[PDB]
Amino acid sequence: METWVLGRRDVAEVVAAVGRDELMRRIIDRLTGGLAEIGRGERHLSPLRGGLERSEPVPGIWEWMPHREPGDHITLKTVGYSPANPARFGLPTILGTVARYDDTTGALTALMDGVLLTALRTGAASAVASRLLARPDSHTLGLIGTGAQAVTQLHALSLVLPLQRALVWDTDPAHRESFARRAAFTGVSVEIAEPARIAAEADVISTATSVAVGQGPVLPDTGVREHLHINAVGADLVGKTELPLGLLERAFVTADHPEQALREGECQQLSADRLGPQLAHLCADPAAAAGRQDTLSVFDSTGFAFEDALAMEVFLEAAAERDLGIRVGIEHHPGDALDPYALQ
Amino acid sequence: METWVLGRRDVAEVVAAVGRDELMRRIIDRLTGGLAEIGRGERHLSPLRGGLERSEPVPGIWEWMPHREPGDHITLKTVGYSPANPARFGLPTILGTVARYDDTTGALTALMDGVLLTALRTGAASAVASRLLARPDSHTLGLIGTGAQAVTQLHALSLVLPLQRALVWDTDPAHRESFARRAAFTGVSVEIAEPARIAAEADVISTATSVAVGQGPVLPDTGVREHLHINAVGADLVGKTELPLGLLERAFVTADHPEQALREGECQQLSADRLGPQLAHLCADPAAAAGRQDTLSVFDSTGFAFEDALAMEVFLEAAAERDLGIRVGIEHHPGDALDPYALQ
Numbered sequence: 269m270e271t272w273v274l275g276r277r278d279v280a281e282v283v284a285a286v287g288r289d290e291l292m293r294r295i296i297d298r299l300t301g302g303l304a305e306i307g308r309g310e311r312h313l314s315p316l317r318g319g320l321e322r323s324e325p326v327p328g329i330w331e332w333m334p335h336r337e338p339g340d341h342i343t344l345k346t347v348g349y350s351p352a353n354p355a356r357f358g359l360p361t362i363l364g365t366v367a368r369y370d371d372t373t374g375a376l377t378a379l380m381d382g383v384l385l386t387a388l389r390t391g392a393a394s395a396v397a398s399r400l401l402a403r404p405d406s407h408t409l410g411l412i413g414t415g416a417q418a419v420t421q422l423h424a425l426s427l428v429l430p431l432q433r434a435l436v437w438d439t440d441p442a443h444r445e446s447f448a449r450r451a452a453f454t455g456v457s458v459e460i461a462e463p464a465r466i467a468a469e470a471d472v473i474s475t476a477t478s479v480a481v482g483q484g485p486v487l488p489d490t491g492v493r494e495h496l497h498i499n500a501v502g503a504d505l506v507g508k509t510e511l512p513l514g515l516l517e518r519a520f521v522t523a524d525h526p527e528q529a530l531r532e533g534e535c536q537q538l539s540a541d542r543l544g545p546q547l548a549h550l551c552a553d554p555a556a557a558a559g560r561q562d563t564l565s566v567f568d569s570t571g572f573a574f575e576d577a578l579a580m581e582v583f584l585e586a587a588a589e590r591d592l593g594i595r596v597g598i599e600h601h602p603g604d605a606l607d608p609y610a611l612q
Numbered sequence: 613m614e615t616w617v618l619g620r621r622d623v624a625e626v627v628a629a630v631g632r633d634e635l636m637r638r639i640i641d642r643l644t645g646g647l648a649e650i651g652r653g654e655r656h657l658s659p660l661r662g663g664l665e666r667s668e669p670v671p672g673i674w675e676w677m678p679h680r681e682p683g684d685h686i687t688l689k690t691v692g693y694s695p696a697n698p699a700r701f702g703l704p705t706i707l708g709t710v711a712r713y714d715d716t717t718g719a720l721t722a723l724m725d726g727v728l729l730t731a732l733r734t735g736a737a738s739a740v741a742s743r744l745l746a747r748p749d750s751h752t753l754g755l756i757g758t759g760a761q762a763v764t765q766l767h768a769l770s771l772v773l774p775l776q777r778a779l780v781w782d783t784d785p786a787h788r789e790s791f792a793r794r795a796a797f798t799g800v801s802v803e804i805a806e807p808a809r810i811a812a813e814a815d816v817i818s819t820a821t822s823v824a825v826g827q828g829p830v831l832p833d834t835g836v837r838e839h840l841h842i843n844a845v846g847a848d849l850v851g852k853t854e855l856p857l858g859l860l861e862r863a864f865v866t867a868d869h870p871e872q873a874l875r876e877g878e879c880q881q882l883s884a885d886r887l888g889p890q891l892a893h894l895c896a897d898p899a900a901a902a903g904r905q906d907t908l909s910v911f912d913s914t915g916f917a918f919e920d921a922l923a924m925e926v927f928l929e930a931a932a933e934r935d936l937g938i939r940v941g942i943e944h945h946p947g948d949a950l951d952p953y954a955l956q
């Protein structure tokens with residue numbers, strides 16, 4: 269037995285061969301079906317993730333997220349949020365890896381990059397929610413925060429909605445000015461616009477910012493379109509929120525993971541009895557979303573491990589089909605199972 | 613930047629080049645100083661580990677164990693307990709791996725086998741506790757359970773006590789018959805002995821069994837020597853214990869990690885009020901352990917992530933000096949930190 273390692277090159281080759289659009293569509297479709305299975309009680313929500321706060325160079329967190337498929341495998345994503353990474357080190361804010369363990373033996377069976385996978389499934393989740401809750405003729409996307417997640421927010425939403433333009437804002441002028449180049453492949457025209465203009469004109473908004481704890485909101489409490497749908501994607505430290513309380517109190521709010529969102533999502537601001545049905549329920553039974561496209565709605569997205577396990581399965585199917593990756597004997601399996609020093 | 617991977621062949625090379633006695637002594641030395649640092653408030657106990665119980669083929673658990681050295685690195689050990697592994701698959705019961713992440717950026721910097729490392733630091737921890745709590749002239753070690761952990765229990769204790777004899781028992785006859793061969797490198801004469809004889813004759817005992825939940829104790833509450841010290845090393849599922857309650861209630865009890873021991877150790881059987889200072893406090897001030905050398909004492913060992921971080925440092929130091937391991941680009945670091953699709 270050896271661990272199947274998909275390095276950065278192998279992940280790059282899967283995306284290159286399949287294409288960004290088709291790979292995102294596969295993950296959207298797998299996520300939709302998997303969420304529906306949770307909604308029907310055929311699968312379980314993942315347990316609450318855990319994490320470690322880091323104060324330097326700016327406040328961040330490092331988190332672990334398990335998900336078990338009983339009798340088959342266990343997935344663990346480890347992921348850091350380090351929002352000084354881009355300016356200070358040229359590294360992405362979100363840095364992680366995803367591992368798979370055999371449920372019968374405990375053995376580490378596969379290990380892959382989590383940077384691209386995280387961005388893909390985070391965009392995909394917003395696309396699943398926005399298909400349910402945004403107007404199907406939505407034309408104008410608003411983006412607050414134009415870093416890494418904003419790229420796959422725009423990409424995923426452009427595959428499920430007839431987006432013609434994106435109005436975008438970032439507190440860093442360099443980051444908002446560079447977004448049009450990073451977005452060009454989608455064909456969606458990009459225009460920089462202040463948050464009040466985005467609130468007024470967008471049919472759908474994604475907020476995906478590295479705003480600090482207690483420094484929200486990133487979208488002002490002002491006039492929005494009657495049918496606005498917001499993907500609240502930003503999430504890291506307890507106490508970090510992006511939306512104004514007044515808007516949230518007026519909205520139909522669905523969380524990807526209610527217990528997690530009450531701790532780390534926009535639902536931190538809400539009484540727990542104010543939550544709409546969770547996304548998995550909407551996927552299994554759309555009665556709860558019926559009519560909500562035409563009124564204010566918020567998808568409170570925190571991310572949970574089942575989404576990473578599903579996206580990893582999409583990558584592993586593609587990689588297995590193409591015999592990609594390497595095999596590394598990492599775990600020591602002594603020829604005598606009862607002798608740790610039998611370095612066989 | 614690439615991940616440094618120490619596979620099975622590299623860990624084997626470290627043992628071959630350093631030697632077993634020297635490697636174990638280095639880990640004992642690091643663990644003793646690191647525990648003293650916790651006992652003096654210069655370092656802190658790892659957070660409570662997390663875990664997922666599994667029921668097939670027999671009840672087992674899979675756990676994740678993080679530890680943070682602020683400003684330096686985060687360590688995470690993922691480890692399975694699957695006690696049917698030896699008989700069904702020729703695999704060790706304990707299967708795991710240890711990862712190191714840069715604390716500043718979150719990047720995965722190192723990954724290695726956890727199977728041998730776990731056995732080494734678990735032996736080392738018993739050696740640290742027994743040096744503090746067993747009579748310095750202890751001649752007879754008892755071992756209940758003669759699987760993987762028992763090998764390093766004997767090895768480590770033989771390096772800190774004047775052991776002349778090991779009395780050993782296992783419910784599987786093939787496992788107790790093979791222990792002497794696995795233990796030969798220690799030079800300590802091994803005798804098979806039933807648990808009642810071990811209880812009556814041993815100066816120090818380690819219990820390290822795969823006993824099922826509710827099927828203890830593995831050592832009878834009979835005559836024990838007045839000065840007996842026990843390392844209660846077995847730990848996995850909630851409800852699993854190895855010692856008789858009446859013996860435990862008469863003992864001075866110290867846990868490696870009090871909150872973990874209350875959940876998964878022999879301290880499950882006791883009130884939280886009933887515990888002594890933890891092992892770290894005894895390392896920092898041995899005057900609290902000296903008096904208890906001549907009375908009944910129990911070290912309640914669950915394992916915690918700091919021990920894995922310290923043992924990993926020993927292996928990385930030795931591996932770097934010998935230029936061992938490989939470099940694998942696992943994490944995706946896009947050419948543009950704000951563009952998840954900018955594959956290198």
Ligand SMILES: NC(=O)c1ccc[n+]([C@@H]2O[C@H](COP(=O)([O-])OP(=O)(O)OC[C@H]3O[C@@H](n4cnc5c(N)ncnc54)[C@H](O)[C@@H]3O)[C@@H](O)[C@H]2O)c1
Nearest residue numbers: 361413415416417439443476477478479502503569570571
């Ligand atoms: N919900 C999920 O599943 C999920 C998954 C991944 C990341 N995230 C979260 O999304 C957020 C963004 O991640 P990223 O990878 O895009 O980070 P990033 O650093 O690439 O982008 C964040 C951007 O937000 C900008 N910003 C900071 N404060 C702002 C404000 N007040 N208004 C507008 N812009 C602001 C920054 O200048 C930066 O350009 C983080 O909180 C992250 O933890 C969530």
Ligand SMILES: NC(=O)c1ccc[n+]([C@@H]2O[C@H](COP(=O)([O-])OP(=O)(O)OC[C@H]3O[C@@H](n4cnc5c(N)ncnc54)[C@H](O)[C@@H]3O)[C@@H](O)[C@H]2O)c1
Nearest residue numbers: 705757759760761782783820821822823846847913914915
């Ligand atoms: N405290 C720690 O840090 C730490 C570290 C590693 C393992 N452990 C725990 O130690 C225990 C042993 O692990 P291992 O790797 O040696 O497993 P192993 O399967 O190699 O050995 C366990 C042995 O116990 C024997 N056994 C089962 N029931 C028994 C009984 N009633 N009396 C006597 N022997 C019995 C089995 O036949 C087997 O030989 C497990 O509970 C494991 O989770 C603890």
Ligand SMILES: O=C(O)[C@@H]1CCCCN1
Nearest residue numbers: 347349503504570571572
């Ligand atoms: O699910 C995730 O991967 C993100 C990482 C950053 C913190 C919020 N959750």
Ligand SMILES: O=C(O)[C@@H]1CCCCN1
Nearest residue numbers: 691693847848914915916
């Ligand atoms: O600390 C450890 O490595 C062990 C693994 C098995 C369960 C008990 N703790």
Ligand code: NA
Nearest residue numbers: 500533534569
């Ligand atoms: Na959120």
Ligand code: NA
Nearest residue numbers: 844877878913
């Ligand atoms: Na124990």
